[model samples]
Target: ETPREKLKQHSDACKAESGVSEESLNKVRNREEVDDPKLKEHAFCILKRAGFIDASGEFQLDHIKTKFKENSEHPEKVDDLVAKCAVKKDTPQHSSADFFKCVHDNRS
Candidate 1:
């Protein structure tokens, strides 16, 4: 399978394992989360692999219908659900080349 396909498969697997619904996936894709670490990582990984992040390892998490409130609650067992969920802020903002560069640079 292509890299894109592989990434989608990975995302699907993660969603299934995490019990994330299509609505939740859409919300994440649109960047609607108060403090969803797993969702953030999931969105970042997908956008990064799909070449959508901006620069400085930061991406806007926009809400589709409603804004995410600071007190809003979501799945708290994110870490337990996804052991591979790294809460690090190593997102992809620059070009794919720059992304690879960041990865290479951070790999010591």
Candidate 2:
């Protein structure tokens, strides 16, 4: 499946895990502001399902690299984008939310 299809699958699984609403999902999908705690959990849950982040809130950059290369048209750009997106924030939720937002903004 394509990235959007894969994202939807992740969203559904994370929704079941976090009880976040479709509206919140759409907001996150659009990189809009999310103030809800469950929405933040939803964001991390999606990354968890993708194996993009680990249990200890660390980004699995190798896993991210492989996934991006598999989906990206410009594989050469993957490394730079991953480096820019692999950031740590105040909490795992914030980190995951920011990471997802950064990646989504850089999507090709």
Candidate 3:
């Protein structure tokens, strides 16, 4: 599926899951700063929710992250990279794609 389609479906379901508006989606999509933690988590979930699933028929971030984390020396750093994609006074705005890119790029 295309990014547009994935985003549309993800955004639709996300509104139900988080009751987030299109405006919030746009805020994240356009890389506009958003302060709400739930909105940020919703955006992160939406990005990971796109076009993939495990053999158990569910998508789990920690399940996969465990594999990646186990190979690395720092198990505690698994959740640390989220800050890079977060929007704050000290952080710049980022998109769903940017989050994934950051995740892969930070495979250090």
Candidate 4:
């Protein structure tokens, strides 16, 4: 599936699993930051479904790079964002939120 399609599929599945509000999901889809704690769980669940995060709560950097390269016009810039955003935080929920926020902030 294309990246956008994959995002929808994963988000739908994660939404049910995380019990996060659809409004919050829509906000994130629009690249709007949300301050909900449930959204953090939602992000972690989506990242796991997308294969960006592992069972042990660590990021799968190669999976992230591959997904970015699959849709990015400038593959070289992917490295910069991945390096700058792919950080492991105190928990998977916070980690996923931080990564998503960083990418959303840095997107061109």
- Name the top lDDT candidate: 4
Native-vs-model 1 lDDT?
0.37
Candidate 2's TM-score = 0.65
- List the candidate numbers ranked by TM-score, top first: 4, 2, 3, 1
Compose the digit string of candidate 3's lDDT tens values, residues 68-102. 46777666665555445322322222254345444
Which RMSD does model 1 reach against the true structure?
15.1
Q: Model 3, residue 1: what's the lDDT?
A: 46
For residue 67, model 2's alpha carbon misses the true position, in angstroms, by 0.9
Model 1 lDDT per residue over 1-108, tens place: 557644435456445544434554454333233334444445544554454444355433332112223333553333232222222344442222222222223312
Estimate the TM-score of every prediction: 0.28, 0.65, 0.31, 0.69
Give model 4's TM-score versus the native structure: 0.69
lDDT-wise, the better of 1 and 3 is 3
Between which residue pairs do clashes occur in model 2? none
**Backbone Cα, N, C clashes tallied per candidate:** 2, 0, 0, 0
User: Which window of ten consecutive residues has the lowest lDDT sum in model 1?
Assistant: 61-70
Write one digit per residue (lDDT tens) for candidate 4, span 51-80.
678878877778787777787667777766
Q: Where does the lowest 10-residue lDDT sum fall in candidate 3?
A: 85-94
Error of 3 at 54 (Å): 7.8
lDDT of 2 by residue, 1-108 (tens): 456644445567555566776776577666465677676787787777767777788777788778778865678777777777776677766677666567776645
Instruction: Report the Cα lDDT for residue 61, model 4.
Output: 78
Root-mean-square deviation (CA) per prediction: 15.1, 7.1, 10.4, 6.5
